[PDB]
Amino acid sequence: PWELTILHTNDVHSRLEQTSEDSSKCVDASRCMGGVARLFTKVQQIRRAEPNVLLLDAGDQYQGTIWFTVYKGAEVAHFMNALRYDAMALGNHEFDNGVEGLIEPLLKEAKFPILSANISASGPLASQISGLYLPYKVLPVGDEVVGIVGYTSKETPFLSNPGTNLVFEDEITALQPEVDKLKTLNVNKIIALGHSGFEMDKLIAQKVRGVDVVVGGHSNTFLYTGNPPSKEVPAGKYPFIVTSDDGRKVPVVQAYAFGKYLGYLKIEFDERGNVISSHGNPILLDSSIPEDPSIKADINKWRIKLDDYSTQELGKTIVYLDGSSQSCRFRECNMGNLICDAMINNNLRHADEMFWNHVSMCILNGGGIRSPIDERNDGTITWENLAAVLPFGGTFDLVQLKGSTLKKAFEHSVHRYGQSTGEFLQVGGIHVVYDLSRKPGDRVVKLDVLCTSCRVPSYDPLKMDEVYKVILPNFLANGGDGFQMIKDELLRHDSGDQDINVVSTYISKMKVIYPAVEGRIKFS
Amino acid sequence: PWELTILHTNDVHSRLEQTSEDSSKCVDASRCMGGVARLFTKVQQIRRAEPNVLLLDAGDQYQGTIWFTVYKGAEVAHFMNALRYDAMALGNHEFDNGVEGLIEPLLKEAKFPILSANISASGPLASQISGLYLPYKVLPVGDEVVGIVGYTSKETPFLSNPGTNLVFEDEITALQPEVDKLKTLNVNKIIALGHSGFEMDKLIAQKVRGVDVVVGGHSNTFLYTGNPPSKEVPAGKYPFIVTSDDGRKVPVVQAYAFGKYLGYLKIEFDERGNVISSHGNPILLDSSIPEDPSIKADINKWRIKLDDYSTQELGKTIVYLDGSSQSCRFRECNMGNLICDAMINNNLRHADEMFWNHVSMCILNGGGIRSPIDERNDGTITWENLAAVLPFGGTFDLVQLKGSTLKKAFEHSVHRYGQSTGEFLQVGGIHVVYDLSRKPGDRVVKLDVLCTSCRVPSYDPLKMDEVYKVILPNFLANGGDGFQMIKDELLRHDSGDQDINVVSTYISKMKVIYPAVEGRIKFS
Numbered sequence A, B: 001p002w003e004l005t006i007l008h009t010n011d012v013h014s015r016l017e018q019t020s021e022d023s024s025k026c027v028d029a030s031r032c033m034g035g036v037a038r039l040f041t042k043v044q045q046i047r048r049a050e051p052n053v054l055l056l057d058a059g060d061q062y063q064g065t066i067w068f069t070v071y072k073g074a075e076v077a078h079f080m081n082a083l084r085y086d087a088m089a090l091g092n093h094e095f096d097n098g099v100e101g102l103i104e105p106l107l108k109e110a111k112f113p114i115l116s117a118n119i120s121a122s123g124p125l126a127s128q129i130s131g132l133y134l135p136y137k138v139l140p141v142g143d144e145v146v147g148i149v150g151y152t153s154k155e156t157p158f159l160s161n162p163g164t165n166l167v168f169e170d171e172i173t174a175l176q177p178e179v180d181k182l183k184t185l186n187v188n189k190i191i192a193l194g195h196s197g198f199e200m201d202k203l204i205a206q207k208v209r210g211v212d213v214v215v216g217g218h219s220n221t222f223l224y225t226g227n228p229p230s231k232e233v234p235a236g237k238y239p240f241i242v243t244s245d246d247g248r249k250v251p252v253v254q255a256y257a258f259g260k261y262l263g264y265l266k267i268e269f270d271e272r273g274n275v276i277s278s279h280g281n282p283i284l285l286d287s288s289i290p291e292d293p294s295i296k297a298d299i300n301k302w303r304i305k306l307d308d309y310s311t312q313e314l315g316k317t318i319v320y321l322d323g324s325s326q327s328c329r330f331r332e333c334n335m336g337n338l339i340c341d342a343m344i345n346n347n348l349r350h351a352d353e354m355f356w357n358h359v360s361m362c363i364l365n366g367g368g369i370r371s372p373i374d375e376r377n378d379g380t381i382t383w384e385n386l387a388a389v390l391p392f393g394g395t396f397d398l399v400q401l402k403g404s405t406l407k408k409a410f411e412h413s414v415h416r417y418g419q420s421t422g423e424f425l426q427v428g429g430i431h432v433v434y435d436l437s438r439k440p441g442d443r444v445v446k447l448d449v450l451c452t453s454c455r456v457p458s459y460d461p462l463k464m465d466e467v468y469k470v471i472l473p474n475f476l477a478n479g480g481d482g483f484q485m486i487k488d489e490l491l492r493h494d495s496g497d498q499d500i501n502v503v504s505t506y507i508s509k510m511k512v513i514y515p516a517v518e519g520r521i522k523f524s
């Protein structure tokens, strides 16, 4: 039997440096995790021990920290090249800077193939991008070859900025003919590597005949066999076994996010390319693994431009930006309005005749706003100033919520009002009126929301049965601050852009800001 | 006696082309007025007849039409040079593009002196601008000399964008020592040429010892002796005679605005430079005076780039811009909100620790919004599209109104509601609630306004005795649409930027707009 070791990462999201246990800024070095210098140490160790190794990335290296803000993907090409990745699938966030922000920095500079079989181009873009990404690549491994076939979320137009010259095809429709073609070319060992989420990965393992292994991403899915080594709770065993329509056992793997773990799957194949066995587990990249000194010194050299950028003026405010707890945990605060307005601006996607924009609504825990910004430094706002307001390393995610769920969230917002607790919600595209003299759970007396399916945006009463798109912190999507109803009742969840980066881009665009308190939240 | 003919213009405001009787777009050529080609004909005719002539401009050539938008002052230097102006005073609108937008295009290219005795610079700007404008110039006229001493509104920081490196001194304080200096230099004929308004011009004639004649601007003041030749109603005789503190009779002149008239004042001086007599009248530049063919052909050549610019994309909308009468004369309309938001953005001036901005409030007659803009031309907005929305050639002016006056204006807004009349007001920085079941005059049931004297902008109830700054169309400042209370009760009025240009600059800054209907105007 021919044994292959698959090493894999996904949704690394700009975590070039080691991180805290929750993937935020490293504070206590002796307990920090991940980063590319530590990953290098572990990959090097495995390649010294195992003859047949592939190192794969399932997309979403782009977006997550100031590294991406400043280097715009040049850091991805440089450090993935240094780690000698064998292949990468395109994720949704590889489109955050448009097709031009993908072609240059990443597609032209990567020394490995970049894959997606379900993205097609038209017009002059088709000629410009031809061959810079591939449906698949056949790679030599020892005396054998392995086909790797890519895929990317069909939902990418709603979750990034790919433009109107790319079409994202149904994954299974696009994959099947490519996998059948590889069989005609005597390629009997096939990996599907791609970026659609665990649920789609299981459908691909079930329905795409000839796929031996699925290596996925997007949903930040943690899988594990045995007692978990850290705080992430597994969604299933590692690998997750799907029984295919043709009766094979197909392993499905993912490795959480943020470079905290290295996926590690051993596959035994027979002479005909059938999987005999599969086993493994993600490896926690904790402090017991030393950071490679050479990669660490290069990271520290690249950090100088980040430190310089962090104190540059992004733009100006002519108003005090009130991010005080006394304001933002008790009433509408103009820092809350700014952040929610930045969140909606970040989520303007391709227009369509059925909506002015796909999403119009924002909620934000007031306890997540951690500092004001004074306007008396000649109005200057810097990244360092925003990092004081938003220090947690979160994202502003897209969810679908029934109106009933959102009403329950606004009741929870004020269920114990008056104690300076963090659950009080700041908003955008929502007008709420509370009556605090009513019983907890029955304090919301008006709730109006900005339409999407309209050419002129206007407010209408919230409907209990209707599903709304809402932008909100990942902290709330995951049920933080007691918002268990959001976690338990949401219909869709996709991870969005870095919190600081969303606000910095908005301020840079606007140049001069003056957010008001305007009656989004009232008390009767 | 030595006779001087003073020819003068003021507040020409980018009217390079001939205009309608109301200074808007020329439609019926055979009845059009003004423009630089016609002015050339008349100035040439007078210079053939009168030996001692000066042609003077009292400021505010900048701002008013697409000429300024595109050529940014290069058209002012070119066509004032072609007319051989002898001198110009700086007006407030010469600062609209900052000090850099004054130095280059105008101060470096004018072939005549540009004057202001009450503007001082500090820091590196002082070295950069030294000598490019002058307090005064002594000009030879025949065998004599005449001193011309400039001045500019002390209020310019509130009415334009001069920056924080220029100081505007009290006019009389600055002028007196310059006029006394000219006497020490054997200059006994002195003209004060400047841009502070008729009321300040009369104070200068009264108090500045040695001034023989005041040639002013800013207030668009029409003066005439006899039956007026057109629709402008005179504010007084031409010249207006002030009795000075030293007992001399000092003529004060102005010539309306928009290049419709050429001021014409004959002065007789004795050997010692005392005024013996003064007489004249502005000359209506009507169609009985032919446009100079050479200047007309040059105007037509310069127009090609304006025609090209008028169909270029300024920016995009992702929302229908509802400028329909059915919306904007009956309820809050998102085109109204856009225009008012552009008006406030245009009036962001130098911050100060006593206010976030000096003005926060806007009102706009809904009958002044003349077209929607469809978002389905790939979202494009052009200048031509904005000129359909705002076709009247107006300005967005700054006034001071008591709260009582503004309440009366909001009552008038709905006094005959339901007839699709133009007086219904669109707003910014104001939240109004009407109850139409009440009697006319008592329909306003809530009126809240955005603070200025605050670090965090918020809404408070309007106070009847407090004075508010408001941005509004010149049509309303002049009592149009039956708003007689505004004209009769306002405390201050300064003319602002061209209506189209205000909206075009805002859209260009924003890049992508999505104005909502958000509850600025409600009905109970």
Ligand SMILES: O=c1[nH]cnc2c1ncn2[C@@H]1O[C@H](COP(=O)(O)O)[C@@H](O)[C@H]1O
Binding pocket: A365, A366, A367, A368, A392, A394, A420, A421, A422, A423, A473, A475, A481
């Ligand atoms: O990781 C996080 N992300 C976002 N908000 C957080 C996080 N951890 C704490 N918070 C907020 O911080 C509040 C507690 O702050 P404290 O009352 O100042 O200790 C919570 O109620 C949350 O609103």
Ligand SMILES: O=c1[nH]cnc2c1ncn2[C@@H]1O[C@H](COP(=O)(O)O)[C@@H](O)[C@H]1O
Binding pocket: B365, B366, B367, B368, B392, B394, B420, B421, B422, B423, B473, B475, B481
């Ligand atoms: O010169 C002008 N400037 C601004 N608005 C004007 C002017 N002339 C007319 N209007 C507006 O046009 C309305 C009349 O439009 P109509 O009902 O469509 O004929 C008036 O009630 C005003 O609101």
Ligand SMILES: [Ca+2]
Binding pocket: A188, A189, A190, A210, A211, A212, A272, A273, A274, A275
């Ligand atoms: Ca196989």
Ligand SMILES: [Ca+2]
Binding pocket: B188, B189, B190, B210, B211, B212, B272, B273, B274, B275
């Ligand atoms: Ca004299």
Ligand SMILES: [Zn+2]
Binding pocket: A011, A013, A060, A093, A218, A495
């Ligand atoms: Zn991701």
Ligand SMILES: [Zn+2]
Binding pocket: A060, A091, A092, A093, A195, A217, A218, A219
């Ligand atoms: Zn993703």
Ligand SMILES: [Zn+2]
Binding pocket: B011, B013, B060, B093, B218, B495
């Ligand atoms: Zn003017």
Ligand SMILES: [Zn+2]
Binding pocket: B060, B091, B092, B093, B195, B217, B218, B219
């Ligand atoms: Zn002026």
